[model samples]
Target: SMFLPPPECPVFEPSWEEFADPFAFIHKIRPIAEQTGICKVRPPPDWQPPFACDVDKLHFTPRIQRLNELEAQTRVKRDYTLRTFGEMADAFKSDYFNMPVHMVPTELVEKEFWRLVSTIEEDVTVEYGADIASKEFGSGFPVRDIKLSPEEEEYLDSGWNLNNMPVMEQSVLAHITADICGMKLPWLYVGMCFSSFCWHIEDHWSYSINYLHWGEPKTWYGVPGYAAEQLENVMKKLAPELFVSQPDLLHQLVTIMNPNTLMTHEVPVYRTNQCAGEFVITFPRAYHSGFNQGFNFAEAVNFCTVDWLPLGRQCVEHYRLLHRYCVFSHDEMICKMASKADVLDVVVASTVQKDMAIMIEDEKALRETVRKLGVIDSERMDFELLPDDERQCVKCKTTCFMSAISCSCKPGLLVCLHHVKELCSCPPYKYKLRYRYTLDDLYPMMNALKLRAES
Candidate 1:
């Protein structure tokens, strides 16, 4: 069996007073509990979500899992109706994919998961229910358009209501980028027996909240944000094949591993068994993986807050170090905020100024170094006009922004200034600098943010 004893993860049962302000409550406990990178929150007894969908009628594409890896490499999918999956899960005198989640021990479920992924352990045939969304079924949260029963409205106002919460997680960027549904909206997950999510961080290192609406329990493994690289180092040591550069971004690999192995190797690992009605919060950069005990329905969403802006900048920089593609340009996001500095929230404007300081300093240093290398950055390219892949660095493939070195010699190809030398033997003059903002124009954006923050 791949599982040893399960480890401890943070779990919170906040009193009504404590739960009054989720944002403040989370931060208040952060100093003592932040490293766990995850916490399961249990609402007061009366708190529940207003779930309206008829499971029998709901259908989705079930993306199959790859047992050896953390997540499925390719989605070999099948059509699944919630009713059919429930019967398959728990055999009742009559049940749909329903297995009584409580019947299984968390320890046994944990062990089964590891055995399948331990490479050397016995292979188990399992298919996780996947490829579902809030958009398809509509969120449990009350929408202006959706007609809801009164009981549904009761849950809509509960602390667990995803849409009603105003200041949860990192939210400023959703406003800055005008991506109303991007990070703020919920993503639904409908899990059946053994359905799982592999160990990985949220996109852009953002935070996540996942709640089980009903049915089975979800088993989880978590590593703190601070120990993210330690886990990565251990993963590379244990399976170097997974880290090797792929042909393109679509070939990204993510797989599960035994928490016992991680703990033995001195990496801090933790676990939790999340059941129906519980909310799970994952912190920035936390690496987590999990599986379901049986058929279940859950909703999760990504979010960003004022406090996360600095971390967001740092996350983007780290992505550049890995040559990993970014979900969005951190600089573009800041500039967008600056463009609307007049309307920005006071605290949000303050936070973005700090990140802006980092961006400006980094850009200034980058420009000076490129100039020293005789690369003149005078040509301005409207990178926003082109699609993302088009502006990628020719050398490292990071999405280009702020400043990029382009060459007539290479036509449309551009390289991040960091990889200026690797672009080609073409002389520095052959490199036309494509910049989004002149140094003069950039300084005022920061000033505007500073004034907004002060005001």
Candidate 2:
């Protein structure tokens, strides 16, 4: 099921191809973005002149060995569980709980990925609460620790486990680390930092490829690593005011039937305003953020880390010797060692582009289906459920029935077959019978009933 696409597949772009260079890939795929309204090629008038896409500055290549080494260094020694918010709170207070690891400074942990590893160590600590089987804490929590039973060990040994652990750990780790790291993590906080909202670049162990699924349009600004210091200065000068506080108010402003002065921001940015059927790819750690002119946007993000170890293999190999005391089994540990050659190979192969194309097509078909069904804003429908009269059926002159498929007609409206046939000849205003109707199709009948009663 995980490997196969859904039967009614919405995204099915069979001819999509992957590219080694993200900048080059965007040039090729810009048409897809334009056709789907994921983002327009041109920047908004209010936006500063669009920045030139820097292919070299935004590229990412991750080292498998570094990740594998970190994974081994931080693997849980014993099974542990965190079930409640209170328990989570307690874990954060512990010493093993290393909060706030960032990539830029090469601190105790350099990459955002390692900060996550540090949190996993804290999360699976069995000390806080005892593991009581079948009890609240019995099964242990599934947040940071992968919930692998003995039967699942084989699967756990597979490469699949590598992806799953980072995702599982990030459920709690990402938030805690983001808070500590001073990065503005997204609302749906899970996976590595790459999975967060908005398309941006970062230096994971490798280069990263980000694929968007749904939500507000995003923009990315790619600058060279040499420009990191300059970019930080720019961010410090701009990001504070642009951070969204009251997203609801912003959305309301956009809906007003006038050309009001919506809002504005000043930052070197790449922007994409996505509607229902759109997608975009971002290279690893390319500085980026939401292009909120005023609207609440929702989206899904997926990312793959690239390996860049081969170029520095000699240096890394020597470093590994110094760190041997901290290392564990070589077979298990080697997975963290990323080779530059392998990293480039994956980037060049770009097999995941096909998967992304498929997703894009699927989203388009689903949006079309939704349009056909006439389903309006989900949030508005939720609000509509609050009022009583609003919930009543509009047809058959009765309140909505909890289980009845159709409404019961009023006394004057119900009649025998001959009487009903004769009534069909009557004027439209003097109708004697009608089918049961729901609020979804009975607004007119409801209004007529109100009008007659008033008269």
Candidate 3:
């Protein structure tokens, strides 16, 4: 016996009623799916969205991948026309297997992938495209440009559309003015045989859903959010190079490691083979990685629901501890949602209110501590007005939100209240508290959200 693949994750077949709203269906399945970290959802048979594209016309640059475990790679890479890529993709698998394309067992590919990555003698390089949709390339799903059939129009406007998920009413990230195109937009993956995604979670621990528009099945391995730390600890111990703090935001710490290694370490791992037309949802904080069974096209987008509010706050705190750059300020998003409470979904308003309470209390404690340390002067500064890089806390690198400690001695430099001493050598008396809003100003925001939710 070579490599025993991990156990399969749960698969759901929702009725037409259950599948009406993508967000609701996800929440209903959360209890079971969250346990496994990933789940497959097969839409009702009548719900097919036609896949129509001219293969020769679409193109992208492909990124080269060297098959070796724990190898360093960036999160995004890419060029090839859809037609040319398919030809090479099919030929590679056929020649390598000495068999027809469909006859090659997925299990065999899985086993060989592990073998080739760990093999010292073999060097198999592959190419694939992973990028945010743009002029050069766009989403695989149905879009608004063409004079289309009624079915195409039906699916294009559907809530299940990956393109619409980010701008949907329930999405917490929809309110933020920051242009987080990379996170909020759907990413297209043009995959050939063994073109794999490394183990990593979405930025800010947001949930992601991937759809294989057509072509071959994509295989995935998932570790539940609860086991994320367990998996990371194992990875850090074995691949210490990746644990080294990235020099900056540009250096990504993602790698291709065997799932067997993780399962052997007692971290629960789940696997699924997603065919064309199916959807794979990876919960917040879940760690997922996979390779294409063959040439395939898939679209995935990251989103945050009301259930993620508390976890989103926790993620920002964790990012601070690691000195990681945040995708956006969690507190700012919360406040923005609260400001538009009247227009928010009731459930989202309720969740935002609760998270806002915790934020206010935490800010109060931090401000009090800084005050006692001799930061007696204060100013009403609008942190949102400043560019992100200019306002980051010097020690933690988190995008400052509610309050920050700034000293006149270090012009344009700031430290979050938690790092007041780290700002500079200047005495605390010279430090001024730069705050977005006072305690008196925050309670009213929470009240508005509460009233909206209750109404």
Candidate 4:
């Protein structure tokens, strides 16, 4: 009765002692919190990074938002500087609408969002600046010009500080490829009432953390990492057009539906109303969507930690299965780190060692299966050393790594073994093989990781 009993998503309140090593603390709770797929982090009573940013001086291109109560896919755009966005947010909550805003319980709100309205005149639109702020507007963290109190400086170097994320093999994907937009730093999001993001996971199933710098509540609905496929099945059933091939699922716009509907279908879902100074963590592959209760400023970023490697591989394989596009080659990232085991961070080296073992075992068996189907000659090629553009599947253009089948008839282009039959009109006998590393070479690199981790 009290709005569906305030649905469950774990909330962790850490003391300064417990939160001192932010990364290690996250590592400790990851197993349990990740199971829930999304968690709200309440920093220790003494710890709060002051939110300081100039409004009119900051610049960003705004993405338009439609009231989800209308249509989630098609949206609207009206420009507003930060100085005036509150007026826009205020307009949406007024008696300008048939329903009074405060009477709308979030549960009732979400339940009636898509049912509430229709037509152009009745439609509401909001403005959102949802893009990397660091690159354009400068760091949103402890500023160079602003004097920080000890309280503020404590967070400046914390792993949660997007600007200070240490480069480790765990984050190798972001470094290896700059082609992925806004992939490197925290994305700054400024939102007004009812401005929403639709259901989606981070690209490559990476984890995401969002901090509401100072704002009214941002409502969230999250489906657990384990229920990703169940959520997908539900989506495909309700909106088959979104899952259709070709124009590509990533580019295709998404829609909104009630979380209650998902729960009715037996998918595990949780809700949270993230308010000012709270942190929200979305685990790898967690499907989540949310909207603002009022005007807000937030900072969010996608990241990978050591625990994410296994999931990363699974994410890529899943992408292939769905015929979806990829932001970077997961295998390329794994092998890249394995090759640098000598200098890798110990924790990262150890994690890579474990994931590499699985990759090797799987690659070994896959080649064995294909060998039975008549793949013979093999040679090694350093796919990482080659320009990324050169290492794609000839037919599909998927960035290839680990192993690929090539033909002398086409000296340069390579196709993943999955398309071994289609690398041109060249006869089977003309085909050659290339690999990022030989199976023989992989074991030793793994051995180096063991030594690195131990020493």
Candidate 5:
């Protein structure tokens, strides 16, 4: 008659030494934690970074959310000062269950949360704040600026700092020229009781780490990367509307559903309650959703490792098939790293070389196919110089990087080799192959990376 929480996810209590390097720690734990999709990490007792912020000065407008399963809600839409919001949030939770905030059992909240969302008669709306760090509201983590205490200075340079994660050595997104603020910068999430994140993976299937700065426990449910498709099938079966093809990149749809519903379909799920100072890592392609137990504050960021190179390419291809917009051009990032092979980390150079070989082979076949279709005219165009929006494939909308077909009949429009025919009614004779580099130019670039890795 009561809710049965999903199996708890694995948790790690790392020593100070092990926790010093966040990337190294993550790589070391991947073998075990990847199986669970999301894992909790508790730092050594002494690793706490000072959290100092003026609640009155920190303010954000909150987005209202309807408590209906699979309801459509746009991401991020929040104004309340930290103090007033916390007061209202606490009072609301206390009034709902007639108990103090902490006295309300997490299990009971979980059960009631699911029930209210699923029941058509109940109309419960909640508000929460989500935004990337800006001058008006800065990160909860200590950042350098004014005079800092020795304690704050110690953590300012720490690899474990969320602000530094995106620019760390092993992160691929760090090299991209385009500004992908949503994916590259740390996001601040201010939550009230039952404020939730829907089931979704990070953009480009990259890994994400979230740290709860302070507040009541945040409850989470996760599906391992391997079972992501299985979980999706279950959701698509019941909520077909959410599966409808989105009109653009920003319209990616997500929804909240009871874990029991997914579990009934034999999809594996895991749960955890993240407290202040705890870190949650969600692996590539893992599906995760959670709701805050009460008013709380958290920070999170997405990053890619060398191991994710092949998967990143595959993700772009999958987006092409779905006609979904790309976050950043995968091929463009690969080539940029190749161009800077001398400075690249040895392992990263080697990994980029491997992915480059496959990219070359695929490009060769694509160019040949376009040639046979009578796209005889060719020109060298610097794809990197084009704005991402300008270089998108007219048909699939995948941001073009390697080569694109253009026609005189339609100026400023282009299509990927796969969709040469979709560009226009004009004959293939009028089509031009706008390419970044010849096949000969690409091999030398890959060779540089190979030599660097070998050295």
Candidate 6:
């Protein structure tokens, strides 16, 4: 069981106390951690801490125009480059390298990948840090048994080969450069080209280990929780015109927000050249994002997270916690079956009700059996040694042995003398009545039995 520790750090393990308040602790360490773009921290008093932080910074200084204005210029340049080379298929080859390449249905690949990208773009346009929400963006690119267009087939037929250019002269160069500088890429691509690569914070509550294989991208990182709040607070506090243009202040605000809230911290790594290598370990909830640094294309691979809890414990605890508290009734079950399973068939099941005398006899017999088998002591059994007809008070339906018996009563129907009384308003009860087990009933008889057995 994972138990919470007290306010004071446990003497047995001093390191575990590091994150008394993980958000606060991470904020305090961000400056030093971000310097190398990688670090690890212990858990706080309230939450689990991350093991490492990998940072990758890709640099691209394109001489096209203003930094913010490059979006349109790059689009035009990429469009012209694609047209000059012909259809995308004609410009790219699947078997340019010695590695085995599996083909996928071109239409499916285009539809799925493009649909995912479009969805991510929409999310990014609306939400804060929407570009990297793993739930929204971490889509698996299906690459098995892909087909190529006729133009692509022609490109493959041409003597175009990956070996023609050195690895450094390719996208891998950018990945390697970033990696050497301590940045991490999420995927490893040998010669893959994507129009717009993304940099977003890794998923919450897990470690992100990434490596870039081909192209480079620009990266940016900030404190996890405090940066957002800082930004808001600063705007509310100063409201200065100079603050509007102060990127440094804005960055500081973002960093402050990272620590103040429960969020992940991530630093982006931007790359420019080909054949670059990059890797980063993103602790859970660390905020990070990145974008393509250069006009050239790239490819990379990355792996993140693994299960840590036991399978049986996980299932049992989760199920019990989610469902056990609800009061389940027969009517609820019936309605559920009818509505969800489309089951209209209902059947009547027969149940036997023994007389009070017979019930007492059965209880005694059960008690003796349990005692003889050493399953339970005699004291645990409750017995009423009276016949139904002789003991009128005990025979009444109101004299139930267990609390569950009252569940059978109809709305306005009173307890009757016999079990045959029909009451239709209340829900039908299914459990059988039995003597309530008690420890006092078993003591003396259990001792006697033990002595007899020993003798």
- Scored by lDDT, model 2 comes in at 0.25
Assess the local accuracy of residue 32 in candidate 6 as a C-alpha lDDT between 0 and 100: 49
For candidate 5, write residues 205-240 as lDDT tens digits: 999999999999899999899998898899888987
Error of 2 at 75 (Å): 25
Pairing residues by index, what is the TM-score of model 4? 0.87
Clashes of each: 18, 44, 7, 0, 3, 90
How much is 234 displaced in model 1, in angstroms? 1.5
Model 5 segments beyond 4 Å from truth? 76-78
For candidate 1, lDDT tens digit of each residue in 180-257?
344556777777666667678887888788888887788888888999999999888877767877555556677677
Alpha-carbon deviation at 166 in model 2, angstroms: 10
The per-residue C-alpha lDDT of model 5 at residue 391 equals 92
lDDT by residue (1-455, candidate 2, tens digit) is 11111111012222223322233444455444322212222212231211122223222221111221112111111222222322333333333335332221212212222243235343332121111122121111122243555444433322112223223312111212111121111112111211212222331311222222222222322332233344444433444332222222112110000001111122222233332233333332334332211111222222232122221222223323322111111111111111111332233223222222332343345434433433232211221122323322222211211111111223223221112232233332333222222233333432332333342
C-alpha lDDT of all candidate models, in order: 0.73, 0.25, 0.90, 0.72, 0.90, 0.25
Please give each candidate's TM-score. Answer: 0.89, 0.24, 0.98, 0.87, 0.98, 0.23
Once fitted onto the true fold, the runs of candidate 1 whose alpha carbons sit more than 4 angstroms away are 69-77, 91-102, 115-122, 132-135, 154-160, 163-170, 176-185
The clash number for model 5 is 3
Alpha carbon lDDT at 88, candidate 5: 88
Better of 1 and 4 by TM-score: 1
Better of 1 and 4 by lDDT: 1
Alpha-carbon error at 244 in model 4, in Å? 0.9
Question: Lowest-scoring 10 consecutive residues by lDDT in candidate 5?
Answer: 70-79
RMSD after CA superposition, every candidate: 3.4, 28.4, 1.2, 3.6, 1.2, 24.8
